[PDB]
Amino acid sequence: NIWWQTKGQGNVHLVLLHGWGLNAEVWRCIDEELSSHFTLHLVDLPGFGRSRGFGALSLADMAEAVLQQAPDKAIWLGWSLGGLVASQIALTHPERVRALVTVASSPCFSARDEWPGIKPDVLAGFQQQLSDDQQRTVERFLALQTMGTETARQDARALKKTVLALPMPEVDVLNGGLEILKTVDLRQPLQNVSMPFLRLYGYLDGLVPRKVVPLDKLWPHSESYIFAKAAHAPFISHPAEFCHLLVALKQRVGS
Protein backbone atom coordinates (compact mmCIF):
# COMPACT_ATOMS: atom_id res chain seq x y z
CA ASN A 1 0.00 0.00 0.00
CA ILE A 2 1.34 3.56 0.19
CA TRP A 3 3.29 4.60 3.27
CA TRP A 4 1.27 7.47 4.74
CA GLN A 5 1.87 9.25 8.09
CA THR A 6 -0.55 11.86 9.50
CA LYS A 7 0.74 14.30 12.17
CA GLY A 8 -1.18 17.09 13.84
CA GLN A 9 -4.90 17.74 14.23
CA GLY A 10 -5.45 21.11 12.51
CA ASN A 11 -8.68 21.99 10.62
CA VAL A 12 -6.89 22.26 7.26
CA HIS A 13 -5.25 19.18 5.74
CA LEU A 14 -1.90 19.58 3.99
CA VAL A 15 -0.42 16.74 1.90
CA LEU A 16 3.30 16.87 1.22
CA LEU A 17 4.69 14.99 -1.82
CA HIS A 18 8.45 14.58 -2.24
CA GLY A 19 10.66 14.53 -5.33
CA TRP A 20 12.37 11.87 -7.34
CA GLY A 21 14.55 9.42 -5.47
CA LEU A 22 13.52 10.67 -2.02
CA ASN A 23 10.89 9.79 0.56
CA ALA A 24 8.82 11.48 3.30
CA GLU A 25 11.82 11.68 5.67
CA VAL A 26 12.95 14.75 3.66
CA TRP A 27 10.26 16.75 5.51
CA ARG A 28 11.59 16.19 9.04
CA CYS A 29 13.16 19.79 8.99
CA ILE A 30 9.68 21.39 8.85
CA ASP A 31 7.18 18.74 9.99
CA GLU A 32 7.00 19.79 13.66
CA GLU A 33 6.16 23.40 12.69
CA LEU A 34 3.73 22.50 9.92
CA SER A 35 1.89 19.93 12.13
CA SER A 36 1.19 22.73 14.60
CA HIS A 37 -0.92 24.49 11.91
CA PHE A 38 -2.29 21.64 9.79
CA THR A 39 -3.27 18.04 9.83
CA LEU A 40 -0.11 17.05 7.94
CA HIS A 41 0.09 14.04 5.65
CA LEU A 42 3.57 12.79 4.82
CA VAL A 43 3.60 10.30 1.93
CA ASP A 44 6.20 7.99 0.31
CA LEU A 45 5.27 8.18 -3.41
CA PRO A 46 4.44 4.79 -4.97
CA GLY A 47 7.69 2.78 -5.45
CA PHE A 48 9.79 5.20 -3.28
CA GLY A 49 10.76 4.90 0.39
CA ARG A 50 8.51 2.44 2.17
CA SER A 51 5.85 2.29 -0.56
CA ARG A 52 7.43 -0.77 -2.17
CA GLY A 53 4.40 -2.46 -3.75
CA PHE A 54 4.80 -0.68 -7.13
CA GLY A 55 6.95 -0.60 -10.22
CA ALA A 56 7.09 2.07 -12.94
CA LEU A 57 3.87 4.02 -13.17
CA SER A 58 2.42 6.62 -15.43
CA LEU A 59 1.87 10.02 -13.83
CA ALA A 60 -1.89 9.35 -13.97
CA ASP A 61 -1.54 5.98 -12.22
CA MET A 62 0.84 7.46 -9.63
CA ALA A 63 -1.61 10.20 -8.81
CA GLU A 64 -4.59 7.76 -8.62
CA ALA A 65 -2.62 5.56 -6.15
CA VAL A 66 -1.86 8.66 -3.97
CA LEU A 67 -5.40 9.94 -4.08
CA GLN A 68 -6.81 6.58 -2.87
CA GLN A 69 -5.50 7.17 0.66
CA ALA A 70 -5.98 10.94 0.85
CA PRO A 71 -8.34 13.09 2.88
CA ASP A 72 -11.47 14.42 1.20
CA LYS A 73 -10.12 17.96 0.83
CA ALA A 74 -6.63 19.34 1.34
CA ILE A 75 -3.93 21.70 0.24
CA TRP A 76 -1.68 19.59 -2.00
CA LEU A 77 2.01 20.44 -2.03
CA GLY A 78 4.38 18.79 -4.40
CA TRP A 79 8.17 19.18 -4.64
CA SER A 80 9.71 18.52 -8.05
CA LEU A 81 8.25 15.23 -9.37
CA GLY A 82 5.78 15.57 -6.51
CA GLY A 83 4.63 18.81 -8.03
CA LEU A 84 3.59 16.95 -11.20
CA VAL A 85 1.63 14.41 -9.04
CA ALA A 86 -0.17 17.23 -7.17
CA SER A 87 -0.82 19.03 -10.49
CA GLN A 88 -2.35 15.86 -11.96
CA ILE A 89 -4.64 15.52 -8.91
CA ALA A 90 -5.69 19.14 -9.21
CA LEU A 91 -6.52 18.57 -12.89
CA THR A 92 -8.54 15.39 -12.39
CA HIS A 93 -10.18 15.92 -9.00
CA PRO A 94 -10.29 19.66 -8.41
CA GLU A 95 -13.02 19.20 -5.75
CA ARG A 96 -10.42 17.38 -3.58
CA VAL A 97 -7.90 20.30 -3.80
CA ARG A 98 -8.27 23.49 -1.72
CA ALA A 99 -5.01 24.86 -3.08
CA LEU A 100 -2.21 23.56 -5.34
CA VAL A 101 1.35 24.40 -4.23
CA THR A 102 4.31 23.37 -6.38
CA VAL A 103 7.85 23.76 -5.14
CA ALA A 104 10.84 23.78 -7.44
CA SER A 105 8.79 22.09 -10.09
CA SER A 106 8.09 22.68 -13.78
CA PRO A 107 5.02 21.67 -15.87
CA CYS A 108 7.50 20.39 -18.46
CA PHE A 109 10.90 19.49 -17.08
CA SER A 110 12.37 18.79 -20.53
CA ALA A 111 13.58 21.61 -22.72
CA ARG A 112 11.56 21.87 -25.87
CA ASP A 113 11.89 24.14 -28.89
CA GLU A 114 11.16 27.51 -27.24
CA TRP A 115 10.88 26.30 -23.64
CA PRO A 116 13.70 26.20 -21.00
CA GLY A 117 14.44 23.03 -19.09
CA ILE A 118 16.64 19.92 -19.05
CA LYS A 119 17.76 18.44 -22.40
CA PRO A 120 15.62 15.27 -22.97
CA ASP A 121 18.83 13.48 -24.08
CA VAL A 122 20.26 14.26 -20.61
CA LEU A 123 17.43 12.58 -18.78
CA ALA A 124 17.64 9.61 -21.23
CA GLY A 125 21.32 9.45 -20.34
CA PHE A 126 20.53 9.22 -16.55
CA GLN A 127 17.97 6.52 -17.34
CA GLN A 128 20.55 4.33 -19.04
CA GLN A 129 23.15 4.91 -16.30
CA LEU A 130 20.79 3.47 -13.64
CA SER A 131 21.51 0.01 -15.07
CA ASP A 132 25.20 0.48 -14.84
CA ASP A 133 25.22 1.95 -11.26
CA GLN A 134 21.92 3.00 -9.71
CA GLN A 135 23.51 4.37 -6.49
CA ARG A 136 25.94 6.73 -8.21
CA THR A 137 23.34 7.89 -10.70
CA VAL A 138 20.75 8.67 -7.98
CA GLU A 139 23.41 10.47 -5.93
CA ARG A 140 24.43 12.55 -8.98
CA PHE A 141 20.84 13.62 -9.86
CA LEU A 142 20.34 14.33 -6.17
CA ALA A 143 23.54 16.37 -5.57
CA LEU A 144 22.44 18.79 -8.39
CA GLN A 145 19.68 20.01 -6.09
CA THR A 146 21.56 22.12 -3.53
CA MET A 147 24.40 23.60 -5.49
CA GLY A 148 25.22 27.21 -5.19
CA THR A 149 23.66 28.02 -1.80
CA GLU A 150 25.36 29.14 1.43
CA THR A 151 24.51 25.73 2.99
CA ALA A 152 25.11 23.64 -0.14
CA ARG A 153 27.28 20.96 1.44
CA GLN A 154 25.13 20.45 4.60
CA ASP A 155 21.93 20.34 2.53
CA ALA A 156 23.33 17.76 0.10
CA ARG A 157 24.41 15.75 3.12
CA ALA A 158 20.87 15.97 4.44
CA LEU A 159 19.35 14.78 1.15
CA LYS A 160 21.78 11.88 0.91
CA LYS A 161 21.01 10.86 4.52
CA THR A 162 17.29 10.69 3.47
CA VAL A 163 17.87 8.46 0.49
CA LEU A 164 20.19 6.25 2.53
CA ALA A 165 17.88 5.87 5.56
CA LEU A 166 15.50 3.49 3.65
CA PRO A 167 16.10 0.72 1.09
CA MET A 168 16.83 2.07 -2.39
CA PRO A 169 13.86 2.14 -4.82
CA GLU A 170 13.94 -0.57 -7.51
CA VAL A 171 15.53 0.50 -10.78
CA ASP A 172 12.30 0.38 -12.73
CA VAL A 173 10.75 2.82 -10.28
CA LEU A 174 13.67 5.18 -10.71
CA ASN A 175 13.65 4.81 -14.47
CA GLY A 176 9.89 5.39 -14.60
CA GLY A 177 10.16 8.52 -12.53
CA LEU A 178 12.77 9.96 -14.88
CA GLU A 179 10.45 9.06 -17.80
CA ILE A 180 7.66 11.14 -16.14
CA LEU A 181 10.05 14.07 -15.85
CA LYS A 182 11.34 13.65 -19.43
CA THR A 183 7.95 13.49 -21.18
CA VAL A 184 5.16 15.08 -19.12
CA ASP A 185 3.98 18.52 -20.32
CA LEU A 186 1.21 20.10 -18.28
CA ARG A 187 1.73 23.64 -19.64
CA GLN A 188 -1.63 23.81 -21.45
CA PRO A 189 -3.94 21.97 -19.04
CA LEU A 190 -2.83 23.93 -15.96
CA GLN A 191 -4.31 27.02 -17.58
CA ASN A 192 -7.74 25.69 -16.49
CA VAL A 193 -7.06 25.20 -12.76
CA SER A 194 -9.17 27.62 -10.68
CA MET A 195 -8.34 27.00 -7.02
CA PRO A 196 -5.42 29.00 -5.54
CA PHE A 197 -2.24 27.92 -7.41
CA LEU A 198 1.05 28.92 -5.82
CA ARG A 199 4.35 28.13 -7.50
CA LEU A 200 7.54 28.37 -5.38
CA TYR A 201 10.99 28.48 -7.00
CA GLY A 202 14.61 28.76 -6.03
CA TYR A 203 16.60 31.42 -7.87
CA LEU A 204 19.67 29.16 -7.97
CA ASP A 205 17.80 26.00 -9.09
CA GLY A 206 19.82 24.13 -11.68
CA LEU A 207 17.00 21.74 -12.66
CA VAL A 208 14.07 24.20 -13.05
CA PRO A 209 15.58 27.34 -14.57
CA ARG A 210 14.31 30.61 -13.11
CA LYS A 211 13.67 31.77 -16.69
CA VAL A 212 10.36 29.79 -16.63
CA VAL A 213 8.86 31.92 -13.90
CA PRO A 214 7.78 35.04 -15.83
CA LEU A 215 4.42 30.75 -16.56
CA ASP A 216 3.25 33.97 -14.91
CA LYS A 217 1.93 35.02 -18.35
CA LEU A 218 0.76 31.56 -19.45
CA TRP A 219 -1.09 31.01 -16.16
CA PRO A 220 -2.39 34.47 -15.16
CA HIS A 221 -4.51 33.01 -12.28
CA SER A 222 -1.39 31.48 -10.71
CA GLU A 223 1.03 33.15 -8.35
CA SER A 224 4.76 32.76 -8.05
CA TYR A 225 7.29 33.19 -5.21
CA ILE A 226 11.06 33.07 -5.83
CA PHE A 227 13.43 32.28 -2.92
CA ALA A 228 16.50 34.47 -3.78
CA LYS A 229 19.15 32.38 -2.10
CA ALA A 230 17.75 28.88 -2.53
CA ALA A 231 18.29 26.16 -5.06
CA HIS A 232 16.03 23.19 -5.77
CA ALA A 233 15.26 22.55 -2.07
CA PRO A 234 14.06 25.84 -0.58
CA PHE A 235 12.34 24.20 2.35
CA ILE A 236 15.79 22.82 3.40
CA SER A 237 17.76 26.02 2.98
CA HIS A 238 14.96 28.41 4.09
CA PRO A 239 12.58 26.39 6.29
CA ALA A 240 11.17 29.32 8.33
CA GLU A 241 10.33 31.39 5.24
CA PHE A 242 8.86 28.31 3.58
CA CYS A 243 6.62 27.44 6.55
CA HIS A 244 5.43 30.99 6.88
CA LEU A 245 4.24 31.10 3.27
CA LEU A 246 2.10 27.96 3.98
CA VAL A 247 0.65 29.56 7.15
CA ALA A 248 -0.36 32.63 5.14
CA LEU A 249 -1.93 30.34 2.52
CA LYS A 250 -4.11 28.62 5.11
CA GLN A 251 -5.98 31.85 5.61
CA ARG A 252 -7.07 31.72 1.94
CA VAL A 253 -8.66 28.27 2.10
CA GLY A 254 -11.75 27.02 3.80
CA SER A 255 -11.91 24.64 6.72
XYZ file of C-alpha atoms in Angstrom:
255
model
C 0.000 0.000 0.000
C 1.343 3.555 0.188
C 3.293 4.600 3.270
C 1.273 7.473 4.744
C 1.868 9.247 8.090
C -0.553 11.862 9.497
C 0.735 14.300 12.168
C -1.182 17.092 13.838
C -4.900 17.738 14.226
C -5.447 21.110 12.507
C -8.676 21.990 10.624
C -6.887 22.263 7.262
C -5.248 19.180 5.741
C -1.903 19.578 3.994
C -0.422 16.742 1.901
C 3.298 16.874 1.216
C 4.692 14.992 -1.817
C 8.447 14.580 -2.239
C 10.658 14.525 -5.334
C 12.368 11.866 -7.338
C 14.547 9.421 -5.465
C 13.525 10.671 -2.022
C 10.886 9.789 0.564
C 8.817 11.477 3.297
C 11.819 11.685 5.670
C 12.950 14.745 3.660
C 10.255 16.754 5.506
C 11.594 16.186 9.042
C 13.163 19.785 8.990
C 9.682 21.394 8.848
C 7.184 18.744 9.992
C 6.996 19.794 13.661
C 6.157 23.397 12.689
C 3.731 22.498 9.923
C 1.892 19.928 12.127
C 1.186 22.728 14.604
C -0.919 24.486 11.910
C -2.290 21.636 9.786
C -3.272 18.042 9.834
C -0.107 17.045 7.942
C 0.090 14.039 5.654
C 3.572 12.787 4.824
C 3.598 10.302 1.926
C 6.196 7.987 0.310
C 5.269 8.184 -3.415
C 4.439 4.794 -4.969
C 7.695 2.783 -5.446
C 9.786 5.199 -3.284
C 10.764 4.902 0.391
C 8.511 2.442 2.173
C 5.853 2.285 -0.564
C 7.432 -0.774 -2.166
C 4.395 -2.461 -3.751
C 4.803 -0.682 -7.125
C 6.952 -0.597 -10.221
C 7.091 2.068 -12.938
C 3.865 4.021 -13.171
C 2.424 6.623 -15.432
C 1.872 10.023 -13.833
C -1.893 9.352 -13.967
C -1.544 5.982 -12.219
C 0.844 7.459 -9.628
C -1.614 10.199 -8.813
C -4.589 7.758 -8.625
C -2.620 5.565 -6.147
C -1.858 8.656 -3.971
C -5.403 9.935 -4.084
C -6.805 6.580 -2.873
C -5.505 7.166 0.664
C -5.978 10.943 0.847
C -8.336 13.089 2.876
C -11.469 14.418 1.203
C -10.115 17.962 0.828
C -6.634 19.338 1.338
C -3.932 21.705 0.235
C -1.676 19.594 -1.997
C 2.009 20.438 -2.031
C 4.376 18.792 -4.399
C 8.168 19.185 -4.643
C 9.712 18.517 -8.047
C 8.255 15.231 -9.366
C 5.780 15.567 -6.505
C 4.626 18.808 -8.033
C 3.590 16.946 -11.197
C 1.632 14.414 -9.039
C -0.167 17.233 -7.171
C -0.820 19.030 -10.485
C -2.354 15.864 -11.962
C -4.638 15.522 -8.915
C -5.690 19.144 -9.206
C -6.517 18.568 -12.891
C -8.536 15.393 -12.394
C -10.178 15.916 -8.999
C -10.285 19.663 -8.411
C -13.017 19.200 -5.751
C -10.416 17.382 -3.576
C -7.901 20.299 -3.796
C -8.266 23.487 -1.715
C -5.006 24.865 -3.079
C -2.206 23.558 -5.335
C 1.351 24.403 -4.229
C 4.313 23.373 -6.381
C 7.847 23.764 -5.140
C 10.841 23.777 -7.436
C 8.785 22.086 -10.091
C 8.089 22.681 -13.780
C 5.024 21.667 -15.868
C 7.505 20.392 -18.461
C 10.902 19.487 -17.085
C 12.367 18.785 -20.526
C 13.577 21.612 -22.719
C 11.560 21.873 -25.874
C 11.894 24.142 -28.887
C 11.155 27.505 -27.237
C 10.877 26.302 -23.636
C 13.701 26.197 -21.001
C 14.440 23.031 -19.092
C 16.644 19.917 -19.053
C 17.755 18.437 -22.397
C 15.619 15.273 -22.971
C 18.832 13.482 -24.078
C 20.260 14.259 -20.610
C 17.433 12.577 -18.782
C 17.642 9.609 -21.225
C 21.322 9.447 -20.340
C 20.527 9.219 -16.552
C 17.967 6.523 -17.337
C 20.553 4.330 -19.039
C 23.148 4.905 -16.297
C 20.795 3.473 -13.642
C 21.507 0.008 -15.074
C 25.200 0.476 -14.839
C 25.219 1.952 -11.260
C 21.921 2.999 -9.710
C 23.514 4.369 -6.486
C 25.940 6.729 -8.209
C 23.345 7.891 -10.701
C 20.752 8.666 -7.980
C 23.409 10.470 -5.928
C 24.426 12.552 -8.981
C 20.845 13.623 -9.859
C 20.336 14.334 -6.167
C 23.536 16.372 -5.569
C 22.444 18.788 -8.389
C 19.681 20.012 -6.086
C 21.560 22.119 -3.530
C 24.399 23.598 -5.491
C 25.223 27.210 -5.185
C 23.664 28.018 -1.803
C 25.356 29.139 1.432
C 24.510 25.731 2.987
C 25.110 23.639 -0.138
C 27.281 20.959 1.441
C 25.132 20.448 4.596
C 21.928 20.335 2.526
C 23.331 17.756 0.095
C 24.410 15.746 3.117
C 20.868 15.966 4.439
C 19.348 14.783 1.149
C 21.784 11.883 0.906
C 21.007 10.856 4.521
C 17.294 10.690 3.470
C 17.867 8.462 0.491
C 20.185 6.247 2.531
C 17.877 5.869 5.559
C 15.500 3.492 3.653
C 16.104 0.724 1.094
C 16.828 2.068 -2.391
C 13.862 2.136 -4.825
C 13.943 -0.573 -7.511
C 15.525 0.495 -10.775
C 12.297 0.381 -12.735
C 10.755 2.823 -10.279
C 13.666 5.175 -10.714
C 13.651 4.808 -14.465
C 9.894 5.387 -14.604
C 10.160 8.517 -12.525
C 12.767 9.960 -14.884
C 10.451 9.063 -17.797
C 7.663 11.141 -16.138
C 10.050 14.073 -15.854
C 11.345 13.653 -19.429
C 7.948 13.485 -21.176
C 5.162 15.084 -19.122
C 3.975 18.518 -20.325
C 1.214 20.102 -18.282
C 1.734 23.641 -19.640
C -1.631 23.806 -21.455
C -3.941 21.971 -19.038
C -2.830 23.931 -15.962
C -4.308 27.022 -17.576
C -7.736 25.690 -16.487
C -7.059 25.199 -12.758
C -9.169 27.615 -10.683
C -8.336 26.998 -7.025
C -5.418 28.996 -5.542
C -2.236 27.922 -7.406
C 1.052 28.923 -5.825
C 4.355 28.128 -7.496
C 7.544 28.367 -5.376
C 10.990 28.476 -7.002
C 14.608 28.756 -6.028
C 16.604 31.420 -7.865
C 19.673 29.160 -7.969
C 17.804 25.997 -9.088
C 19.824 24.132 -11.682
C 17.002 21.738 -12.663
C 14.073 24.195 -13.047
C 15.577 27.336 -14.571
C 14.309 30.614 -13.111
C 13.672 31.773 -16.692
C 10.362 29.786 -16.631
C 8.863 31.915 -13.899
C 7.782 35.039 -15.826
C 4.424 30.754 -16.564
C 3.249 33.971 -14.911
C 1.928 35.020 -18.352
C 0.764 31.561 -19.448
C -1.094 31.013 -16.158
C -2.389 34.471 -15.156
C -4.509 33.007 -12.284
C -1.388 31.479 -10.705
C 1.029 33.152 -8.355
C 4.761 32.757 -8.049
C 7.290 33.186 -5.212
C 11.060 33.065 -5.833
C 13.434 32.284 -2.922
C 16.503 34.466 -3.777
C 19.146 32.377 -2.099
C 17.748 28.878 -2.534
C 18.290 26.157 -5.065
C 16.035 23.188 -5.769
C 15.259 22.552 -2.075
C 14.060 25.839 -0.578
C 12.338 24.201 2.354
C 15.791 22.816 3.401
C 17.757 26.022 2.982
C 14.962 28.415 4.093
C 12.577 26.390 6.288
C 11.167 29.317 8.325
C 10.333 31.389 5.245
C 8.862 28.311 3.579
C 6.616 27.443 6.549
C 5.431 30.995 6.875
C 4.243 31.101 3.273
C 2.103 27.962 3.978
C 0.645 29.562 7.154
C -0.357 32.632 5.144
C -1.931 30.345 2.521
C -4.109 28.625 5.113
C -5.978 31.850 5.606
C -7.072 31.716 1.938
C -8.660 28.273 2.097
C -11.746 27.016 3.803
C -11.909 24.640 6.723
